[PDB]
Ligand binder design. Sequence first.
Ligand SMILES: Cc1cc2nc3c(=O)[nH]c(=O)nc-3n(C[C@H](O)[C@H](O)[C@H](O)COP(=O)(O)O)c2cc1C
Ligand SMILES: Cc1cc2nc3c(=O)[nH]c(=O)nc-3n(C[C@H](O)[C@H](O)[C@H](O)COP(=O)(O)O)c2cc1C
Ligand SMILES: Cc1cc2nc3c(=O)[nH]c(=O)nc-3n(C[C@H](O)[C@H](O)[C@H](O)COP(=O)(O)O)c2cc1C
Ligand SMILES: Cc1cc2nc3c(=O)[nH]c(=O)nc-3n(C[C@H](O)[C@H](O)[C@H](O)COP(=O)(O)O)c2cc1C
Ligand SMILES: CN[C@H]1C(=O)NC(=O)N(Cc2ccccc2)[C@@H]1N
Ligand SMILES: CN[C@H]1C(=O)NC(=O)N(Cc2ccccc2)[C@@H]1N
Ligand SMILES: CN[C@H]1C(=O)NC(=O)N(Cc2ccccc2)[C@@H]1N
Ligand SMILES: CN[C@H]1C(=O)NC(=O)N(Cc2ccccc2)[C@@H]1N
Lengths: 337, 337, 337, 337
Amino acid sequence: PRLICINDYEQHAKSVLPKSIYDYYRSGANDEETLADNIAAFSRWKLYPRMLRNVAETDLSTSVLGQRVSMPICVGATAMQRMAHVDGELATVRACQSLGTGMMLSSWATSSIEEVAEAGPEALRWLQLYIYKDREVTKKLVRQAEKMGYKAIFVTVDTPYLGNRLDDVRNRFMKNFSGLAAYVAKAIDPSISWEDIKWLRRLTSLPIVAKGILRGDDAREAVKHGLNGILVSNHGARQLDGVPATIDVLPEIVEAVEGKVEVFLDGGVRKGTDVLKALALGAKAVFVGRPIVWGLAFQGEKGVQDVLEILKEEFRLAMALSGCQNVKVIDKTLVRK
Amino acid sequence: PRLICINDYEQHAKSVLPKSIYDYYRSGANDEETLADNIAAFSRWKLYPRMLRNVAETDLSTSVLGQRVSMPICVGATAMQRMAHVDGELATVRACQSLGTGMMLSSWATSSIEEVAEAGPEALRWLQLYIYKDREVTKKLVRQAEKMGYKAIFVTVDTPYLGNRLDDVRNRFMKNFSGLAAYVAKAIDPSISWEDIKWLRRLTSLPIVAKGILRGDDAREAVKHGLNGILVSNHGARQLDGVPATIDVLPEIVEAVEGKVEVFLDGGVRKGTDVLKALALGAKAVFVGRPIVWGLAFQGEKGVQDVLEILKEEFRLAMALSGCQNVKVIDKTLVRK
Amino acid sequence: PRLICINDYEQHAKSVLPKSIYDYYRSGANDEETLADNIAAFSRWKLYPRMLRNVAETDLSTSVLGQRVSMPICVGATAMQRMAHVDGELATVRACQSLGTGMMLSSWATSSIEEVAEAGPEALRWLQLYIYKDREVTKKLVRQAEKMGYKAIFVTVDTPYLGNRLDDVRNRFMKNFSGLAAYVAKAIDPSISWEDIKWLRRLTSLPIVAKGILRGDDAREAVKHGLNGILVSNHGARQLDGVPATIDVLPEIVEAVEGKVEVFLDGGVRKGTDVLKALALGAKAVFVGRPIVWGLAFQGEKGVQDVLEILKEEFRLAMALSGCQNVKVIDKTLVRK
Amino acid sequence: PRLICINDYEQHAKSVLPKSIYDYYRSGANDEETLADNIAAFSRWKLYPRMLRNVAETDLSTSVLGQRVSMPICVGATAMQRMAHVDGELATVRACQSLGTGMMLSSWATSSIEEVAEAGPEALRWLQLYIYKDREVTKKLVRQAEKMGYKAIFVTVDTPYLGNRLDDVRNRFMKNFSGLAAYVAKAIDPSISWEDIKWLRRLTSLPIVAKGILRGDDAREAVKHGLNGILVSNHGARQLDGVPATIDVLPEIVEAVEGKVEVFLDGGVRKGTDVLKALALGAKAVFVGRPIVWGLAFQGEKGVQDVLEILKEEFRLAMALSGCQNVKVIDKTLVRK
Ligand SMILES: Cc1cc2nc3c(=O)[nH]c(=O)nc-3n(C[C@H](O)[C@H](O)[C@H](O)COP(=O)(O)O)c2cc1C
Ligand SMILES: Cc1cc2nc3c(=O)[nH]c(=O)nc-3n(C[C@H](O)[C@H](O)[C@H](O)COP(=O)(O)O)c2cc1C
Ligand SMILES: Cc1cc2nc3c(=O)[nH]c(=O)nc-3n(C[C@H](O)[C@H](O)[C@H](O)COP(=O)(O)O)c2cc1C
Ligand SMILES: Cc1cc2nc3c(=O)[nH]c(=O)nc-3n(C[C@H](O)[C@H](O)[C@H](O)COP(=O)(O)O)c2cc1C
Ligand SMILES: CN[C@H]1C(=O)NC(=O)N(Cc2ccccc2)[C@@H]1N
Ligand SMILES: CN[C@H]1C(=O)NC(=O)N(Cc2ccccc2)[C@@H]1N
Ligand SMILES: CN[C@H]1C(=O)NC(=O)N(Cc2ccccc2)[C@@H]1N
Ligand SMILES: CN[C@H]1C(=O)NC(=O)N(Cc2ccccc2)[C@@H]1N
């Protein structure tokens, strides 16, 4: 294999993973209209590069909720990574610790909070949480993440029930505690409200990011409840089909929060120019989901490291060709839809 | 067969029904531009879901012209159901009586008004009517529907002549009284005017819905003639080709009637998110045509029951993932085109 | 063969005509972008039909430059019809005389002005003219048309040179006096100006229509020079590629002439709904080019008669389903783009 | 071979050139979204031709930076032409000297400045320059071009680093001094700023054109630094992917420079109507890149001459069919997007 872009990693993963596993990772909800649009929407945003700006020394570094990272490109929560590679999340956190970027650990990981911390003691690590009907286990997760050096909580707010991913049902298809639709119907609480966010905000002094916000009014409510960021996300197009692409709703959310918290994006990031467009529209950083899994499927830690390095170099080139020597000068005039 | 969405039922029906019968049911008029657009138009309307609203107890119930139904998803008139299954309309009305929803019986049914009432005595049942050149038979139908417990009349107003469905002519292709184009040219009155609506309004005290309205001015005229609802319909794209999708004209019609009557939609409903979008734009309920026929072709009553249950569950999930605990809170901010 | 729409006639013509002849008739200029758009543009204009208007007695009749015709659907000039059938233009004029519509005779016909008049003595007949470098032959044509009972002159104004139709060059591919590109470079005058229109206007008292106008300013100039109509035409997309579809420029031209002359359309008419849309946007009538040739290729006079009857019946149905009992009530609210 | 349009030359070049060489010449950056759009964008601009203007004597001549040319169609810089044909740039400059148009010589030519001048002593010739980390060699190039009769400098400003063309990396793929990405990383200066433009402006009294401007603000800065033209260019879509098509950004640049300098376009010119549209939107002339290489691949000098003659004749026809007797009357009302 000669894999030189993120799409090559997906094509390789399709060739080596059982169909059920590949389809678990690549599927979106229902007719997958949002899955296609998360990528198509990036192509509609055009770049207006500045020339002659001196880009000899391109600095990709930024910060996420106060913590320095090497690039505005971080690993999003994807469940059950050991299905892709025997090391799963441990390989992922080692690759993040090599790159100098952060890993968001899924609540449905095939590795424990304490195992991951130990594989990546110097890695920037966050916990993605669901509020479970069992609030005792929810609180136990939060208190384990605090003790194991995790630096934030990403609370997923778009999953009262699991989305309907047809291939998991059509294909006859967790170390911390569709079969997956039935699992959620059991553990995950569909009653969660803003009252539960008030509880979580009182539970921990860790930064909390609301993950899965698509509306400006909900983003303002998150700010009002004392949360510290918004991850503009449609859950990799796996929840409600027919929502907009995240790059299309990002500007409304950035406008609505009036600078009070950091805004992040995930969904459809596959190229350095996607990262650049997201930052031009006001995201502080982006998270990648599927590309990391294809990295694992190729060669575990090394495969994840290669995916993250291809993204980093593509982003560096896009910054340089656009006239941007650092992330602080990536401005809204770089893009038009 | 493992049929888990409405498209699967169509694919199965194509596999088991003679081509002429399948094409009778699936065909639209002329080049079928509206047939494609009835579905494509739903995909252009995007959903803006609210998070954290408490959707543990999702209530799908609503009412149609005063009568309670279990969900805002009802069976539209499709002629000649016994071509799809030996029980035809009797299977359909039994499935509606199990689901707690309504059946609109076609005037060109392969079962009699009195036979259907008897198969579904507790089912909510309406009659779709044409005004026939023979007004005596027209009046006999209305007076049979009143005596047999039907709760409304859906008068079809878009069919002075039958549309030109090419496959019926190219394929060498009624218990109440193209060969079908020639049948209409004989029975159906092309002279029908608003004067005939005044006659029908005086004929019966049953609610009357005008079916096949596409213009706001015609919707206002229906209100002025004392009708009790508008079914925004292009007749499943089988009459005039090149009219807009019904989801696209729905907002104009809702605006034009100023709340005075209920507005319904049919045409292209195949998914729970289609139902949600129609309700967000002000429809009280939607009617499904073809999906019921594919249910019959699969397994008669059980097949219709399965189609209606897939629609119900998809709608429940779309409501929950959008933050809607009941139909009364499905609002216009949920959608944008 | 079972040919029930105009597209079927084209498919049959492709099956029976030598490739060079078929490609001569079906080709557009260069990459054929306008050829595709002449048809695609009709599909973008949507119909908003009125219900319940009494369409029992649909009257398709209208008039063209004062002369009654049975329908607003007339035969446009297409050169060299005997390549499609041994009777060529004589078959075409007999079919027009049966239908009660008009024939525009090409200046590059394979039959003489006096032969056509004689085959269709009761047919409504017009002459399409080019202003030839030889003004004596130009004047001889006009004076023959006047003597043989032709009722107008359609002067083609978009052809100073012939368009570049690639297949005629790639395929190694006139009774009144690319090899065809070379013929024009010889006979047709590229110097023609509005001064030449003044000459033609003084030459004959016959109505004169300017054929091939695409701009409102040129349409106003035609009115100022005392011409009696505008045929909005891109020459069947065979001249300048990348001009708009004729249905898209029709409203600008109708607006610009302020009712002073009749406006006609050709280019991409294949269905009754195309005729209806053109009339809703203010055309008095439309001309069909290629469909007549496919009629000839099928069965000469009978094939042309069948094409014209399919168009007539499709138009009658579209009028009836739109609520229009006659052409005088086809209004601009029937369409929206 | 029977090659009658520019696309035919590309298809022939694909048939005769090794895949690595063909892909070097035809590739764009990353997913090649801009490569497709450079051509698609021309098709969206529609032509509104004037009739009856007298186009018997069509004059294509114009001037570029003061020098007369036979047509507003000139040869752009494409590196390493000897890979396409044994004569490379010498064949190209001979074909330009036959046509009476200009050649822009690449800084990465497979022929020397003094060899090309000698093959085309009477040809209009310009030098495309990069500002190299080695300013001594940069100055040597400029002073050779001045001594050898070159009439301008086109300074490329969009290439601080080379774009990522995937096929050069996936295919295991200079007489004046991806392996090519690595070459640039060595010679080409990523620090170049407007200070370096001030240096180049003081270095030579030759006209200087800034090549690769996409923003109006950068075009105004070029005017302020005393440059004499802007070549609106995305480097044949080979640098930053996802920038707009050059025909789409051309009007902003023409507006921004307020007539102070000539504006040129390259990127996606393949047809005479492309040239016409560019001139209608205010370009003085256009440059062709790839089409010249396909000319070489076919038959060296004769192949380049044939490509340039097909462009000239297509442009002459498009001018004539649009009503334009010379370039001075090609106005903005000819086009609408
Ligand atoms: C296979 C898979 C598993 C996921 N598991 C989780 C999860 O456990 N928790 C969560 O909050 N999001 C989960 N997501 C959503 C991701 O965090 C993220 O929103 C999404 O992958 C981003 O889009 P992308 O895959 O296009 O980069 C998952 C996504 C995928 C594809
Ligand atoms: C096979 C078939 C038969 C139909 N028969 C009738 C009919 O008898 N009366 C009527 O008013 N509408 C009739 N319709 C129109 C339907 O009531 C309804 O408007 C349409 O099916 C809704 O679109 P859908 O099939 O996309 O759900 C028929 C539609 C189909 C597909
Ligand atoms: C084969 C062919 C020959 C034509 N010959 C002539 C001609 O002799 N004179 C003329 O004015 N227009 C000519 N035209 C243009 C037609 O009059 C008319 O504008 C065009 O066919 C209308 O478009 P349609 O073919 O899509 O119906 C010709 C078109 C075709 C396809
Ligand atoms: C094979 C190839 C080599 C090129 N080499 C150079 C170069 O050496 N210097 C430069 O400034 N531009 C270079 N360009 C960009 C061209 O000057 C020009 O901007 C582009 O080819 C125009 O687009 P077109 O190929 O669609 O006509 C190159 C383009 C191609 C395709
Ligand atoms: C369905 N994929 C995930 C997702 O998108 N969000 C989430 O919470 N997951 C946990 C999970 C769900 C089903 C089965 C096992 C684990 C996902 N894997
Ligand atoms: C043509 N399909 C129907 C329709 O769309 N509307 C209607 O009234 N029908 C009655 C019917 C028509 C033809 C032949 C038999 C019955 C339809 N089946
Ligand atoms: C090229 N087709 C025609 C057309 O569009 N307009 C016209 O005047 N024609 C005369 C003609 C042209 C070439 C060869 C023979 C005759 C056409 N046939
Ligand atoms: C990459 N193609 C070129 C281009 O677009 N711009 C440029 O300066 N080139 C010089 C060059 C680059 C790589 C290898 C050899 C020579 C190109 N050939």
